[PDB]
Design a protein around this ligand. Sequence first.
Ligand code: GDP
Ligand code: GDP
Ligand code: IMP
Ligand code: IMP
Ligand code: CA
Ligand code: CA
Lengths: 413, 413
Amino acid sequence: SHMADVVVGIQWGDEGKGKIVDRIAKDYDFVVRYQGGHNAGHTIVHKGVKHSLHLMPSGVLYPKCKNIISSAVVVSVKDLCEEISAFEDLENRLFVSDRAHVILPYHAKKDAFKEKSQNIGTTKKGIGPCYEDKMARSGIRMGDLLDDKILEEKLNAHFKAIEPFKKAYDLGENYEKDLMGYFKTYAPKICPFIKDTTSMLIEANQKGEKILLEGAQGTLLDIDLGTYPFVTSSNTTSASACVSTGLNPKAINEVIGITKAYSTRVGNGPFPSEDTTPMGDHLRTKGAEFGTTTKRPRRCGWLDLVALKYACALNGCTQLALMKLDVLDGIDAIKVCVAYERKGERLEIFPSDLKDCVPIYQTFKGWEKSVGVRKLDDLEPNVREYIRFIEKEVGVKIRLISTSPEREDTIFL
Amino acid sequence: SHMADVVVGIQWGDEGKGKIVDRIAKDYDFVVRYQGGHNAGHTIVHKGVKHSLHLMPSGVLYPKCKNIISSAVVVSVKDLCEEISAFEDLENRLFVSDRAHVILPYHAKKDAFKEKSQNIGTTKKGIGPCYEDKMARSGIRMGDLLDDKILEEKLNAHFKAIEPFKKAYDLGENYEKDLMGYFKTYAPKICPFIKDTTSMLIEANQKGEKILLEGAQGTLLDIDLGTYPFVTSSNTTSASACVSTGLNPKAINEVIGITKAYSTRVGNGPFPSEDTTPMGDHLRTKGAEFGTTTKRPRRCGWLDLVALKYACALNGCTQLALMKLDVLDGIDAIKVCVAYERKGERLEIFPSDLKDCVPIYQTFKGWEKSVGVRKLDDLEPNVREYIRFIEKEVGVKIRLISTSPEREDTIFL
Ligand SMILES: Nc1nc2c(ncn2[C@@H]2O[C@H](COP(=O)(O)OP(=O)(O)O)[C@@H](O)[C@H]2O)c(=O)[nH]1
Ligand SMILES: Nc1nc2c(ncn2[C@@H]2O[C@H](COP(=O)(O)OP(=O)(O)O)[C@@H](O)[C@H]2O)c(=O)[nH]1
Ligand SMILES: O=c1[nH]cnc2c1ncn2[C@@H]1O[C@H](COP(=O)(O)O)[C@@H](O)[C@H]1O
Ligand SMILES: O=c1[nH]cnc2c1ncn2[C@@H]1O[C@H](COP(=O)(O)O)[C@@H](O)[C@H]1O
Ligand SMILES: [Ca+2]
Ligand SMILES: [Ca+2]
């Protein structure tokens, strides 16, 4: 247990990771995004001002933090440049790994094309196809932008390899021209931020500096251990934070699992505790469970402790942050899935195939007014019973409770 | 830091991981292969009998051990069944993850095709292309073989999708019918071994059972942090052992880095300490550096402490095993690369681009007769000083010393 703490979403994303990272970031020297891409959307709100970050790490509102975009991330350079322009004096407080892979316009076109047959429900941003080119070892990395010679060589090889797909993926007649001009525009803007971030973090850890690792997506979206194939293409577990930053597993200190008080997922795939009745629509409305751009409605349902115990085991959570209790204000009865029923069998442990798994619910008396509460003793007795039940059943202590989007509407326990 | 120990190769593979795992496995309840495929070849020798293992974990010679092939591995079913047939009574001591992905004949054909332009020097076994289909979320997994109907639907989608490539990858006209029969032959043989190994290791961790995780390839072949693109398509460091196994970073106890007393790599890519003179041929001859399918001569060179210190930081090694000291018997002067130089500038730290990096060598007086020695006190003084230098420079204690292929020719310190 060295100096590196990890924030991980333990459901299917959108749990409130951005809020928690921004709440705690001021006490860290480094804040690190370690996987995924701009498929992520992490929303921070403070004093009535909202920021929705996609690749920019969530320490950006504290100019003393050094924000790192690490090697297992996939980068859309134009979108990252558009984020950089929203903040002042990022030059010595944002660093992008020279080993991170680059998302090309072909990637999103391929994503949309494959989605016609696979119907996973991806964000159509080309995340998966970028990771495919990484495994092929044909992908372009951010360090390649530092030398026009190699970038040209690599683009030309890309140009020759995508030609049998120009018709299938609707690439266009100006693909080569437009891509070459894309890098002419964006490479000069991003190049000063490209660094060996592996060495930076190896040295920071050896020097005992405080490092916060910001997960994206959620544990149940993990490429290996999630609800495959309804998953993202990166590993999302806490150990993924070591795999590609330079830090080793023995550096990991606290593992903070972020869970909502109910469940959401966006996109297709299994969802044992989903609620498609008007009560599920109530959760969506009161929880504002729509896209970052307010477009993609989420599937909504109840908290699922079978899946939470599984995710907590995969990450080694030492604490939980319980988010959005205020969305449940005014609901008369709150259900929690405590086990699955499968063809007469009661399953206490999350199975590798959720086929025929029906939720078994325990019901809790509802509460009225948790919104904005900042003190434990101000919480209603019924909410405190709900919180106590979760800690006891999952076996991980709840150390943070959020009661609104606002940074300071957070109780520390 | 609980009960899971990790053995990791800290160079470019072939360091002696199979020997070390077999030497220590008897004291463990589980022995787990966690990434790669049958590109691995782990050689164990005991009492003049050799076993060359490819996907079989190296606990197989102790029937009380439970051997696990975990979820991030890629499985060639035919080759695994051929390994199964060489041992007696594997049924309750070998378990294959229902989440592991399956290598199809298409994959090796695509591998050879892409190699014509990329010239990485892969093993041509389809490892990379299998990982690509994983990222695409179109890949077939071991659990799919347990249900005839699901396997049918997935093989159909695969046949459809590979239509455009039948000519380009030299797929036969009999591809569909051959693969159909392949699974009719091999799925019955492998089905009894398919299990939810994620749940097995979650429970093993919770019960405090002793787990040994066996890495494949080596740290400098890591897809993210190795000598890209001259790497394998999986993560190879100790953190990968708790990404996809059902363990988590807090479970990792000892991390044993396996290093040869000199260096090899097979395939193309940078190699700062390579020796292409007749002394390099001598290392190849004396070290039998030709592989399992003895038709792949290795590139050889000297120990590189710059790369070694980098690999130890990425893995968090707590002890080192120094292998093949006996290969250096009779060499008058042993070189160790202690630093790099780049265009006249000295570099202490392993850089992200090895272009123009040349070795700075310190030389050591050689020895004559380390072969087969079993007590530290019986080693020649020059051997002892070489060992002390490595551990002092790298900062990790050398706790195992190997002096021949035989299991028992191993010194414990
Ligand atoms: N009502 C309420 N909203 C919250 C709370 N915490 C976060 N929010 C908001 O809920 C949304 C969280 O979804 P998102 O930002 O996608 O989560 P992330 O991806 O894990 O950072 C955002 O709109 C936050 O502003 C909370 O405790 N109560
Ligand atoms: N001369 C000598 N050979 C060894 C020693 N340890 C292992 N070997 C052999 O060296 C080879 C190691 O390469 P390999 O099996 O591919 O290593 P792995 O992939 O890391 O298990 C094998 O042929 C082993 O039998 C040693 O200490 N001395
Ligand atoms: O922003 C996120 N919030 C919630 N789910 C996401 C997010 N980004 C990707 N996913 C999910 O991850 C899966 C794969 O999408 P991809 O990451 O775009 O490939 C789908 O289920 C997505 O909805
Ligand atoms: O058996 C191994 N020993 C040494 N190198 C290996 C082994 N397996 C794969 N590699 C190396 O890993 C790289 C990629 O090969 P692939 O794993 O077949 O994709 C090449 O440099 C290979 O030589
Ligand atoms: Ca989100
Ligand atoms: Ca080997």
